[PDB]
């Protein structure tokens, strides 16, 4: 009772059911380093101007 597959049938992506668990870390990755502690807060003006030598503002 075998039927030859048509054109385009063997070449398509098929789902498959398995009881094998999904590997959570396939790359055996180490722990990612934490990012820099980003600074939050309101943007206050510069204290006493630019503070470039003798310039007041």
């Amino acid at each position: 009772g075998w039927v030859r597959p048509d054109l385009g049938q063997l070449s398509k992506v098929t789902k498959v059911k398995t009881d094998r668990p999904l590997p959570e870390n396939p790359y055996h990755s180490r722990a990612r380093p934490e990012p820099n502690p980003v600074i939050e807060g309101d943007l206050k003006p510069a204290k006493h101007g630019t503070r470039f030598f003798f310039w007041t503002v």
Partner: protein, 63 residues
Amino acid sequence: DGPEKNYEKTLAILQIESEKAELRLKEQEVRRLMRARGDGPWYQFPTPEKEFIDHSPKATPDN
């Protein structure tokens, strides 16, 4: 206007200049620490972009 005007103006000027000096020294220390061990906003040298990496399945399974 009298001597108290000049006296208190000099006090305000000295406070401003002392605060500016302390801020400049602190800025030098901050820049030195960040350049030595970059962990603040400044001196963040670049890194190749993460979003341009293929994660789709490929021809060779050992990837």
